[model samples]
Target: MATNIVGKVKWYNSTKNFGFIEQDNGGKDVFVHKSAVDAAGLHSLEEGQDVIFDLEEKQGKAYAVNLRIK
Candidate 1:
């Protein structure tokens, strides 16, 4: 089964290269690092952009990975 999930960009910053993604399922927001875009050829996310991503849970937090713009 695929692990990718859909979400909207809560916010992002090029300088910081980090942001949050609000999952469509209405749970907790996930953290998205700019590095996650490497798979999608995206440098940064637009304000409130919709996206799909795989998530990794670490230290009781979920991080957005393999992020792709939707």
Candidate 2:
């Protein structure tokens, strides 16, 4: 099940395994790990691509438990 944490990717660095998401909540960007994205739906990612994700807790941080390419 997806968490429905709709948000835009504010910035990301695949090599670093870290990035931030511009939450739909209109708050600061949330931290995201590559693992979250993988757990969600995939393995490949690119910048400026629209996407959806399920918010979940992991390793003491929020991550995309599920993901879909939008």
Task: List residue ranges in candidate 1 displaced over 4 A.
Answer: none
Candidate 1, position 24, lDDT: 58
After TM-score superposition, the amount by which residue 25's alpha carbon in candidate 2 deviates from its true location, in angstroms, is 6.7
Q: List model 2 lDDT by residue over 1-70, tens digit each.
A: 2376677776778788677776545734567777667775466666665557776665666665466667
Give lDDT for model 2: 0.65
lDDT tens digits, residue span 1-70, model 1: 2257888887887677888888656846788876688767786686678888888887788888888888
